[PDB]
Amino acid sequence: DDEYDYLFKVVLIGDSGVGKSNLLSRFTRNEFNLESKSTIGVEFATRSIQVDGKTIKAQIWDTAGLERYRAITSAYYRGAVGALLVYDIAKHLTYENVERWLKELRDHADSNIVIMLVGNKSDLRHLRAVPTDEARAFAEKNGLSFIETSALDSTNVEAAFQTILTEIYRIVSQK
Amino acid sequence: RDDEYDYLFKVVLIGDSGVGKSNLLSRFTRNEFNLESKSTIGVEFATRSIQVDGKTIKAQIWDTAGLERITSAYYRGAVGALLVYDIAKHLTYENVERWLKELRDHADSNIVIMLVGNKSDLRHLRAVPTDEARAFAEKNGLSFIETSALDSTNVEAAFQTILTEIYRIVSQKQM
Amino acid sequence: LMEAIQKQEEINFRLQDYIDRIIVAIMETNPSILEVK
Amino acid sequence: SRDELMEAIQKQEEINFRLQDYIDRIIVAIMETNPSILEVK
Amino acid sequence: IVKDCKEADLSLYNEFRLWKDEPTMDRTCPFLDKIYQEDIFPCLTFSKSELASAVLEAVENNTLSIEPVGLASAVECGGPKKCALTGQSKSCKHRIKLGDNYYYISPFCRYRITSVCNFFTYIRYIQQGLVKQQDVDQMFWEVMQLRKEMSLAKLGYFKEEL
Amino acid sequence: CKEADLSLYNEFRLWKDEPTMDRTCPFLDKIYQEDIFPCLTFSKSELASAVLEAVENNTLSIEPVSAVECGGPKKCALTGQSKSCKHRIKLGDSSNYYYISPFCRYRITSVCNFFTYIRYIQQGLVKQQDVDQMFWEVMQLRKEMSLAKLGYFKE
Ligand SMILES: Nc1nc2c(ncn2[C@@H]2O[C@H](COP(=O)(O)OP(=O)(O)NP(=O)(O)O)[C@@H](O)[C@H]2O)c(=O)[nH]1
Ligand SMILES: Nc1nc2c(ncn2[C@@H]2O[C@H](COP(=O)(O)OP(=O)(O)NP(=O)(O)O)[C@@H](O)[C@H]2O)c(=O)[nH]1
Ligand SMILES: [Mg+2]
Ligand SMILES: [Mg+2]
């Protein structure tokens, strides 16, 4: 049926071109686009999942990766209980900026917002600029879940959302 | 002092780009004219209430870019249309025939159509003798008027007329 | 230099196709958004 | 081709600029009231 | 090859930008006197000298109006083959009105007169301006275009719509 | 300037129409013989032939940065040279980092780049590029390998 027990808003954030839009398309409608252009405006798509017997409806919001600033970040982060902070394994700069995004979250979004670091375009193995060890390490010390995904070959895209959603579930469950 | 209304009429502005639709709108709603005004992006509407036969009529005047090629949504629910041409550009008048086709295709029948009639303030530049149009108006079942958003002439009258004619047609079907 | 005008005209194509789609939806649900006054 | 190279990108980048500012403003409004609009589906 | 460029005559610009800051329709100011002698008067020089200066009065008052005439009695007023201002016989597709009687006019005459009317219209837009988003520089170059047009009509170079 | 060798152009245009990763098709054979094999030829051949397999299979990966063959920052594993190695290669599931010279890195990524573009076409996945554009990308990809083949590389 269409009923759900929880509705979680999760936002995708990160440098332009790291693949946010395709993580969205892969998870919500299992589609990938190699040629996709930059995202205009703001969107979200939904998918429901089973977590601990209860039905969880995920509301995945996506927006233009070009930020540090304009005009609508306040609304975008509002009500977000989860955030997928995404970088390009093959472009080191996008990892470099990960700290700036954590700042972005620490300013305009609620605390207690579950943050997961991804971890994306793992399918390019000869181009890797960000050794997994360093990323996993950065994540743990900064209180983040961590995973590596490929929207292109589908690896961990599923696991990635399943993870952030069940961890958001538990925090909402305890209280 | 009322703020409430007896009738709500939606009127659309159509015609070649640059005939002065947006200024007809601004002149009617906030009595403002802009000589340097740029092309209209997206879709807008502004509202004004007027008194007709003791009853308050709330007019919803919609405006958009005259160059067209979202039309269905635009004409929907429209009970009136201001088909606008530039007195000084014969070409925008030639295209009045083309606009009626779009009108009698995507909009409800019974829709009141008024032919305007604009930039009457340029006297030395007139390309469309009043009669040639006024005749075209009567033979195709259109009201007709000539206005200048620039000097304010007949702009008020144009709206007052098409609105009361819409009132008259809807009151009488009610009888 | 002449390749710049081909791509920024392609941006208008993309920006405008966006505005249209969004406008259609806005009218299909809550057109109050599109009021000026 | 001459000086006409900088006049085509000058007016067309300024158009894109206004187009984008419009898209931001309505999106804000859309989010401020009925954000259901921005769903893909 | 040779390219078309533009640079302001400092004399005309300073004369103008001075006028712009305190606009007047007065015929005798520095700005308009030059423009009247060099552009307006020569444009309105015609065979029928009584009627010609009469049109000038209509133009200054914006009471002049021009309609086309898709194809009474007098030597005046002209007809489809004969112009009222110059006695020449040519097909006149336009008709002039000085105030609420029609005088027939040749296409050459029309260009000269409208060219002047456009100048007055922009000059008036500026007094009651009404000119907001245009910097003074652009306004200046608008006035030059208006002058270029009159200067061309002055010499017999005109435009026809067909 | 540049002008398409019709011979190659026709060969590709046909291959794009019925893509195969088969090493033996006319399209790929030519490139293997002329570009790929020579590019993946190294002094220490055991590791070399393993690399070739990893590239074809996409199990090879290259990262920036107590085993003997692995080489080290001062010594390349593939070619016996002593040069500062800023990158390390890892073959599939193997978990061993072999240090690779900047010269080697160029040769391998050049080949890995050719294969990953070809794969995109075979499962294409390339919808917005004209056939002509796609062709000249392959030429570009081949040009790189042809230079790496001969010791002309970029750092
Ligand atoms: N190899 C590979 N390419 C990917 C992957 N995900 C996305 N890409 C590619 O890299 C680009 C990423 O596009 P996109 O998903 O739109 O990124 P984005 O985060 O939406 N950018 P923006 O914020 O500006 O819209 C696209 O060309 C896409 O084909 C991935 O997992 N692997
Ligand atoms: N002389 C004169 N100019 C006018 C009049 N009305 C509008 N204009 C001018 O005509 C130009 C176009 O006006 P505008 O209202 O923007 O036209 P539009 O119909 O909105 N164009 P679009 O359909 O693309 O939005 C502007 O320069 C405006 O000032 C008028 O009555 N007289
Ligand atoms: Mg995106
Ligand atoms: Mg408009």
Short mmCIF file of N, CA and C and ligand atoms in Angstrom, two decimals, chain A residues 12 14-22 24 36-40 43 62-66, ligand 3:
data_model
loop_
_atom_site.label_atom_id
_atom_site.label_comp_id
_atom_site.label_asym_id
_atom_site.label_seq_id
_atom_site.Cartn_x
_atom_site.Cartn_y
_atom_site.Cartn_z
N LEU A 12 21.01 15.53 -0.62
CA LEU A 12 22.29 15.23 -1.25
C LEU A 12 23.11 16.51 -1.36
N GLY A 14 27.26 18.29 -1.99
CA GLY A 14 28.61 18.06 -2.47
C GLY A 14 28.94 18.84 -3.73
N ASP A 15 30.23 18.86 -4.07
CA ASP A 15 30.74 19.59 -5.22
C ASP A 15 30.02 19.20 -6.50
N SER A 16 29.91 20.14 -7.42
CA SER A 16 29.26 19.89 -8.70
C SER A 16 29.99 18.79 -9.47
N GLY A 17 29.25 17.82 -9.97
CA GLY A 17 29.82 16.78 -10.80
C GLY A 17 30.27 15.51 -10.10
N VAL A 18 30.06 15.42 -8.79
CA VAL A 18 30.47 14.22 -8.06
C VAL A 18 29.48 13.08 -8.27
N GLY A 19 28.30 13.41 -8.80
CA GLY A 19 27.32 12.41 -9.17
C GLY A 19 26.08 12.33 -8.31
N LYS A 20 25.77 13.41 -7.59
CA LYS A 20 24.58 13.44 -6.75
C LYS A 20 23.33 13.04 -7.53
N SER A 21 23.10 13.74 -8.64
CA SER A 21 21.92 13.55 -9.46
C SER A 21 21.76 12.07 -9.89
N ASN A 22 22.86 11.39 -10.17
CA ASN A 22 22.77 10.00 -10.58
C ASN A 22 22.62 9.04 -9.42
N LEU A 24 20.78 9.77 -7.07
CA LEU A 24 19.34 9.92 -6.93
C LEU A 24 18.60 9.04 -7.92
N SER A 36 24.53 13.14 -18.27
CA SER A 36 23.71 14.12 -17.53
C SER A 36 24.38 15.47 -17.33
N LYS A 37 23.57 16.53 -17.48
CA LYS A 37 24.03 17.90 -17.31
C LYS A 37 23.75 18.40 -15.89
N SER A 38 24.18 19.62 -15.58
CA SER A 38 24.06 20.16 -14.23
C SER A 38 22.59 20.40 -13.83
N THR A 39 22.31 20.25 -12.54
CA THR A 39 20.95 20.31 -12.01
C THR A 39 20.41 21.73 -11.78
N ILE A 40 19.32 22.09 -12.44
CA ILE A 40 18.71 23.40 -12.19
C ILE A 40 17.51 23.32 -11.26
N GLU A 43 14.98 19.54 -6.64
CA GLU A 43 14.08 18.40 -6.83
C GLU A 43 14.17 17.46 -5.65
N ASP A 62 17.56 16.78 -3.97
CA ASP A 62 18.73 16.96 -4.81
C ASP A 62 18.71 18.39 -5.28
N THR A 63 19.88 18.97 -5.47
CA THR A 63 19.95 20.32 -6.01
C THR A 63 21.26 20.62 -6.69
N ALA A 64 21.35 21.82 -7.24
CA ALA A 64 22.54 22.21 -7.98
C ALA A 64 23.73 22.16 -7.06
N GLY A 65 24.74 21.42 -7.50
CA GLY A 65 25.97 21.25 -6.74
C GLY A 65 26.73 22.55 -6.56
N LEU A 66 26.49 23.52 -7.44
CA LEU A 66 27.20 24.77 -7.29
C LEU A 66 26.51 25.56 -6.19
MG MG G 3 22.79 17.31 -9.15
#
